[PDB]
């Protein structure tokens, strides 16, 4: 696919997957919280 | 008024709130203008609106202004934690132990578990394993990690042999155990005049570090030295002064444990301390 198909397509994908990424990187912050 | 008496009653709390010990009579001490039910109706609502704050202690009931983050925090929490989380955050520095919650909260273990799991995911609590036995998993606010306690477990004797090196030097000149007479040569001059120890002085020598740890208190110093008194690695002379037992010789009928080895194979004639029993 072309670059725009990637961008806008990945824009939709990430757009609806940012809730998975939410707990993902939020957990990554909890990794710092593990220190305490 | 809800907002007016809320904000001006929040004003005494955010300003002073008579510290933690504030009681309802202390409200009349400041605002006695409110009639009995007028001040109490908005009290009850602001707790329902999570604005005032109540603590159960001593006489009457304590009160404090909400930080409003804990307010919406517990408002998000279920009815379980609403008391349970609040009941635990009242445990303060030492936290609280799980199973005693049931007698206090009148609940199962099964029902209190899952919400504790939420607060784990909520990260407002953490399992703390303290000096007392690790069957507990006492819980306090994840916001803090205070306790009553070196660390209980090992790597102590490491620094023990260190202090024993120093005080071993402190007696006569250094070891001089190379040949037969190295000791003290009658302790420099006057093997009387020298009264020597660390006490205070050790922490100046403790400055050396070369080990990952914090400082240590003079009381704990003595607590260490007493152990070596018991092991007889060193002697206790004149209060916080100390000597060494000159068992640098064991470092290295006629009697001592070391410098002795048995046959302990075959021949049936030996001496045990058991088999009398």
Curated annotation (Swiss-Prot), chain A:
Q: Where in the cell is it found?
A: Nucleus
Give the family from UniProt.
Belongs to the TFIIB family.
Subunit and interaction comment? TFIIIB comprises the TATA-binding protein (TBP), the B-related factor (BRF) and the B' component (TFC5).
The protein's role, per its UniProt record: General activator of RNA polymerase III transcription. Interacts with TBP. Binds to Pol III subunit C34 and to the TAU135 component of TFIIIC.
UniProt miscellaneous comment? Present with 4330 molecules/cell in log phase SD medium.
Protein name stated in the entry: Transcription factor IIIB 70 kDa subunit
UniProtKB/Swiss-Prot annotation, chain B:
Impact noted for substituting residue 80 to A: Cold-sensitive. Abolishes interaction with BRF1/TDS4
Name the Gene Ontology biological process terms.
termination of RNA polymerase III transcription; transcription by RNA polymerase III; transcription initiation at RNA polymerase III promoter; tRNA transcription by RNA polymerase III
An example of a Gene Ontology cellular component annotation for this protein is:
nucleoplasm
By its UniProt entry, which InterPro entries does this protein fall under?
A: RNA_pol_Rpc34 (IPR007832), RNA_pol_Rpc34-like (IPR016049), WH-like_DNA-bd_sf (IPR036388), WH_DNA-bd_sf (IPR036390)
Where would you say this protein principally sits, based on its record?
A: nucleus
Q: What are the UniProt keywords, alphabetically?
A: DNA-directed RNA polymerase, Nucleus, Transcription
Determine if Zinc-finger is one of this entry's keywords: no
Give its localization.
Nucleus
Q: What effect on the protein does mutating residue 126 to A have, as reported in its record?
A: Cold-sensitive. Abolishes interaction with BRF1/TDS4
Q: What does this protein do?
A: DNA-dependent RNA polymerase catalyzes the transcription of DNA into RNA using the four ribonucleoside triphosphates as substrates. Specific peripheric component of RNA polymerase III which synthesizes small RNAs, such as 5S rRNA and tRNAs. Involved in recruitment of Pol III to the preinitiation complex. Involved in the configuration of an initiation-competent form of RNA polymerase.
Q: Which family does the UniProt entry place this protein in?
A: Belongs to the eukaryotic RPC34/RPC39 RNA polymerase subunit family.
- Please describe the quaternary structure of this protein: Component of the RNA polymerase III (Pol III) complex consisting of 17 subunits. Interacts with BRF1/TDS4.
Give the protein's recorded name. DNA-directed RNA polymerase III subunit RPC6
Q: Which gene encodes it?
A: RPC34
